[PDB]
A paper describes a structure:
[name] recognizes the specific trisaccharide motif as its receptor, N-acetylneuraminic acid (Neu5Ac) α2–3 or α2–6 linked to the underlying disaccharide, galactose (Gal) β1-3/β1–4 linked N-acetylglucosamine ([name]) or glucose. The pentameric configuration of the receptor-binding [name] subunit per toxin and the three glycan binding pockets per [name] monomer play an essential role for multivalent interactions between the toxin [name] and glycan receptor moieties.
In close-up views of the interface between the [name] binding pockets and the glycans, we found that there are more interactions between [name] and 9-O-acetylated α2–3 glycans than between [name] and unmodified counterparts. Most notably, the 9-O-acetyl group forms an H-bond with Thr65 (via the main chain of Thr65) in the BS1, which is absent in the interface of the BS1 bound to unmodified α2–3 glycans. Likewise, Lys59 and Arg61 form H-bonds with Gal and [name] of the receptor moieties respectively, which are also absent in the interface between [name] and unmodified counterparts. Water-mediated interactions in the BS1 via Tyr33, Asp36, and Arg100 to unmodified α2–3 glycans were not observed in the BS with 9-O-acetylated α2–3 glycans, presumably due to the additional three H-bonds on the other side of the binding pocket that make Tyr33, Asp36, and Arg100 out of reach. Overall, the three additional direct interactions between Thr65, Lys59, and Asn61 and all three saccharides of the glycan receptor moieties correlate to the markedly increased binding affinity of [name] to 9-O-Ac α2–3 glycans. With regard to the [name] BS3 that has been shown previously to bind to Neu5Acα2-3Galβ1-4GlcNAc, the 9-O-acetylated glycan counterpart did not bind to the BS3 in either 30 min or 2 hr soaking conditions, respectively.
Numbering used by the authors:
A (entry chain E), B (entry chain D), C (entry chain B), D (entry chain C), E (entry chain A): 24 to 137
Amino acid sequence: EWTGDNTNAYYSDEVISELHVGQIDTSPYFCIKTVKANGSGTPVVACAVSKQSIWAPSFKELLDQARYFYSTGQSVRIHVQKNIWTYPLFVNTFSANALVGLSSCSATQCFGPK
Amino acid sequence: EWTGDNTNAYYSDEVISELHVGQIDTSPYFCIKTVKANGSGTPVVACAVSKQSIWAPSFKELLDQARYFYSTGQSVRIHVQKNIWTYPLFVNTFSANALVGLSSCSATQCFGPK
Amino acid sequence: EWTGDNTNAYYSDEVISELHVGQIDTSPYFCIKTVKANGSGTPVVACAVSKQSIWAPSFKELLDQARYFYSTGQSVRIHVQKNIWTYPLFVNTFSANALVGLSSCSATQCFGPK
Amino acid sequence: EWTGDNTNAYYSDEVISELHVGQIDTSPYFCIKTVKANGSGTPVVACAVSKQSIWAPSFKELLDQARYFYSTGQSVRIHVQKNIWTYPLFVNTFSANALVGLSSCSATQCFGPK
Amino acid sequence: EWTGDNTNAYYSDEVISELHVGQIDTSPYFCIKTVKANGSGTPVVACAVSKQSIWAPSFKELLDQARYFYSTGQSVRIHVQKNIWTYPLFVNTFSANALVGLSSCSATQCFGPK
Ligand SMILES: CC(=O)N[C@@H]1[C@@H](O)[C@H](O[C@@H]2O[C@H](CO)[C@H](O)[C@H](O[C@]3(C(=O)O)C[C@H](O)[C@@H](NC(C)=O)[C@H]([C@H](O)[C@H](O)COC(C)=O)O3)[C@H]2O)[C@@H](CO)O[C@H]1O
Ligand SMILES: CC(=O)N[C@@H]1[C@@H](O)[C@H](O[C@@H]2O[C@H](CO)[C@H](O)[C@H](O[C@]3(C(=O)O)C[C@H](O)[C@@H](NC(C)=O)[C@H]([C@H](O)[C@H](O)COC(C)=O)O3)[C@H]2O)[C@@H](CO)O[C@H]1O
Ligand SMILES: CC(=O)N[C@@H]1[C@@H](O)[C@H](O[C@@H]2O[C@H](CO)[C@H](O)[C@H](O[C@]3(C(=O)O)C[C@H](O)[C@@H](NC(C)=O)[C@H]([C@H](O)[C@H](O)COC(C)=O)O3)[C@H]2O)[C@@H](CO)O[C@H]1O
Ligand SMILES: CC(=O)N[C@@H]1[C@@H](O)[C@H](O[C@@H]2O[C@H](CO)[C@H](O)[C@H](O[C@]3(C(=O)O)C[C@H](O)[C@@H](NC(C)=O)[C@H]([C@H](O)[C@H](O)COC(C)=O)O3)[C@H]2O)[C@@H](CO)O[C@H]1O
Ligand SMILES: CC(=O)N[C@@H]1[C@@H](O)[C@H](O[C@@H]2O[C@H](CO)[C@H](O)[C@H](O[C@]3(C(=O)O)C[C@H](O)[C@@H](NC(C)=O)[C@H]([C@H](O)[C@H](O)COC(C)=O)O3)[C@H]2O)[C@@H](CO)O[C@H]1O
């Protein structure tokens, strides 16, 4: 598997606006919120939980890269795979998206799979 | 278990104002204090111990997040599980609360379980 | 093997312009895009992939160093080994270049092999 | 054992003046120096040594926390256990104080065992 | 062995001018160049190789301490042991000096072995 599989969803020109970290089922997890840098669209919520999903190996690098991007506030493309999380109250608070990639976006192009 | 369980407590629009690191019983641990962004209400102290309680496997993420929210001074929702730590002079100095989550807060809302 | 083997290629006076982090084939990975400080020449793309290639041991060090040199926008020499990644989609989204070294530069020389 | 044990000694309103990193008999170590924020008293020196003494599990948590309080220069409470390091030249260079905790100090009381 | 053995060599009031990360013989390594803050004297180049020499255990501590001092630009004392590294293409580019510790320096004194 790869972040750039067309079986994943991505969203260009996003700013990570909120950040949460917590625990579920003996696993640490974090979620981010992103909103469009130009005020449009609707927000995207994605999580990563450290020992679940096929994306578990990525957890610490994702979290670290989320934390960095969140602090600079730059334009980023956000990559997810839908319909991964299953605890109903959890997906209610956040969503069922699994974070799978982050790409910095210039004003013209983004630096990730497309 | 889950950070967002209803058996836990949360306190919104807090800002982390104190941070302390030590060791207890061969265990790294940290403690934070939080005060209302407006300065009213009663402070919240919560603690994480790296080898103890169901919440140990998230020790370092929570430390890393508590540190980041500590430096920015931003307003956050802090989540605890009360009546966890039992060494009475530890508890007297700090709390019986286990830290189990940290969410960023917008002025709108906070990005965490309710 | 060594970063400064003549079987490797390097590009001085570059600026890490873009950063992407993702997961491929159970490995967390990152790529960078470096531009000549002025606008000259063609960009170079280079990836490091946890647990993959002979350069795997250096993954975390090159990821932290890249994060730094990218936060500063300072001049660097970037060292690569060509034709390492073989997945044609990944190679077309990025490059086959394995990142193998990163050097700061002053106004005259860069601090690394050449 | 605990940072807060009355058999341990501590110092309020310190600022981490210096920071040093080295190795001694197999172990990475670091030493800090603190002086009172008002100029009073005499400097405190404290060291932590990896894989050595009962405080060894805290080495990296304590180093990260020492680095951070160093970078900010904020007022802190340093907790130590005295007479731990015996290496005569090392102690004459720094001290035999083993670093057992770090506490933030704000307008009101220092956040830690008192 | 100890950073401050008089069989080692040190230079005070230096600034970390350049940083390089790379890999050699399956081992991440890094090197630094230091110049007198007053401009006097000749640079010192020192390196740490994560798998080799008796200073291996402190590889990561020194890496983290070098990166911090390099980012503040503050004056330091660098300690090295001469004539450690043997591979001539490596020593010709950098040095045979192994990095063995780092101290922060006042305008009057350095906090470390003399
Ligand atoms: C000139 C003009 O008027 N352009 C606007 C645009 O606002 C908008 O185009 C956006 O910018 C780029 C190209 O113009 C990108 O292609 C965007 O396309 C994607 C993206 O984010 O990269 C493609 C991606 O596959 C889509 N993701 C999914 C799951 O379908 C997303 C997504 O559809 C949007 O970002 C919306 O996301 C949310 C949650 O709101 O877009 C593109 O957004 C263009 C859109 O058609 O409308 C023009 O008017
Ligand atoms: C197409 C199809 O329907 N195939 C079916 C599956 O629907 C079916 O579903 C799985 O059954 C398992 C047996 O209980 C599990 O319950 C699966 O859900 C869990 C899991 O254990 O893996 C339940 C668990 O509570 C979840 N944890 C959290 C924090 O939410 C996990 C977790 O969500 C996932 O591990 C991570 O996300 C994913 C999707 O990877 O999901 C359940 O899906 C299964 C047999 O019952 O196989 C086919 O028969
Ligand atoms: C009077 C008495 O000891 N009764 C106990 C039961 O309570 C006991 O479960 C224990 O509760 C104790 C206090 O009532 C201690 O918490 C026990 O051990 C420690 C531990 O080391 O694990 C002691 C230690 O002081 C505690 N650390 C701190 C910072 O307070 C820890 C820590 O609190 C643990 O995480 C427990 O907290 C929770 C809710 O998980 O507990 C603890 O075992 C039971 C078996 O011990 O039967 C009686 O002996
Ligand atoms: C005699 C005197 O000091 N008079 C006043 C004091 O009111 C006050 O002195 C210090 O004020 C601090 C509060 O900000 C602390 O209360 C000091 O108590 C401690 C401390 O640092 O917490 C208590 C601690 O137990 C002591 N540690 C040890 C090993 O004994 C330390 C220590 O004695 C001092 O920090 C000095 O140590 C060194 C190396 O310098 O003190 C309290 O003493 C302060 C208010 O203005 O100054 C005087 O005016
Ligand atoms: C006011 C002004 O313009 N300049 C002064 C200088 O006089 C001063 O020079 C330094 O003064 C220091 C404190 O007095 C030390 O004496 C320095 O000597 C050492 C050192 O770095 O610690 C002593 C040390 O033992 C020597 N190391 C070895 C292996 O011999 C080194 C070494 O010789 C030098 O660093 C030169 O090395 C190279 C390759 O360049 O010197 C002394 O340098 C100045 C700081 O340089 O700051 C002002 O106070």
